[PDB]
């Protein structure tokens, strides 16, 4: 597929949320690194 998620694996996401290290987040679980402020 296009890429994988750290919590799910929604390859149908409009845009992958990538950080400095490379934490590929779909778009939904990516909020965990913002709202919750986790890793």
């Amino acid at each position: 597929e296009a890429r994988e998620c750290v919590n799910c694996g929604a390859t149908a996401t409009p845009l992958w949320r990538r950080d400095r290290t490379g934490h590929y987040l779909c778009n939904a679980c990516g909020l965990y690194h913002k709202m919750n402020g986790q890793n």
Partner: protein, 96 residues
């Protein structure tokens, strides 16, 4: 009143003039469109910070890149280097 455009000019896939609504990654030079930037094989949408290949007509991902090449031309062997791959840069922002 003022018109601020800082793109190449014409598309490489369609005949539409590139305006402040391309929303595409910084390719080698010839830029495409937010719709003209799709894989020539799986037709999937590209990612950010990942590797990709540029062809003559369209572009190719990193998923079927090992297939598209062999079915067109270019094989460095089963495990051998056949060439080089590029990484998709940051999406062009109209302002910022």
């Amino acid at each position: 009143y003022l018109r601020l455009f800082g793109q190449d000019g014409l598309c490489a896939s369609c005949d539409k003039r590139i305006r402040a609504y391309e929303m595409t990654m910084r390719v080698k030079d010839k830029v495409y469109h937010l719709e003209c930037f799709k894989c020539a094989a799986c037709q999937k949408h590209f990612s950010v910070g990942d590797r990709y290949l540029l062809i003559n007509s369209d572009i190719v991902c990193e998923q079927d890149i090992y297939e598209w090449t062999k079915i067109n031309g270019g094989s460095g062997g089963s495990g051998g280097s056949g060439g080089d791959v590029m990484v998709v840069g940051e999406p062009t922002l109209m302002g910022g």
